Design a protein around this ligand. Structure first.
Ligand code: NI
Length: 158
């Protein structure tokens, strides 16, 4: 159970480095992956990005069902311009929720932990989780994507 970094920490604002091919299939990576699974489970997240536990790598884990997925070096492509508002919380932003507008429909690509391509087109909540998780790899937390501040508040008030 590694510590979740909280908003204010410089390490959540870094652009993350790509997982070098050398780590693919490795004991080092598998250990990092299990560390993130324990931590994500101990605090009840549906997602977690390696920079939230201070690990500077393009690696997210996630999974209204979404499959358990370990996604490395991702790239997102919107499939159209349709956008959609939904509630987001973040473990690095305890006590708060915002409404955020994201692409309704995305393709995502990257590598599984063995080096095998991932390639998926998804919609709705599955597309939201992935966009949320990949924003952490470019140093972005949801309050920086809010355009309607009437919907930003403390979870106990909203
Ligand atoms: Ni998050």
């Amino acid at each position: 159970i590694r510590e979740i970094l909280k908003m204010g920490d410089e390490r959540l604002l870094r652009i993350a480095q790509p997982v070098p091919s050398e780590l693919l299939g490795s004991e080092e990576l598998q250990r990092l992956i299990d560390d993130m699974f324990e931590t994500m489970h101990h605090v009840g997240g549906v997602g977690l990005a390696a920079p939230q536990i201070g690990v500077d790598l393009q690696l997210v884990i996630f999974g209204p069902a979404v499959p358990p997925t370990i996604l490395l070096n991702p790239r997102i492509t919107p499939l159209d311009d349709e956008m959609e508002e939904g509630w987001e919380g973040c473990l690095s932003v305890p006590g708060l929720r915002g409404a955020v507008s994201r692409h309704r429909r995305i393709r995502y690509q990257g590598l599984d932990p063995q080096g095998q391509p991932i390639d998926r087109s998804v919609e709705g909540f599955h597309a939201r989780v992935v966009q949320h998780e990949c924003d952490h790899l470019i140093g972005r937390l949801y309050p920086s994507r809010i355009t309607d501040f009437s919907k930003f508040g403390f979870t106990e008030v909203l």
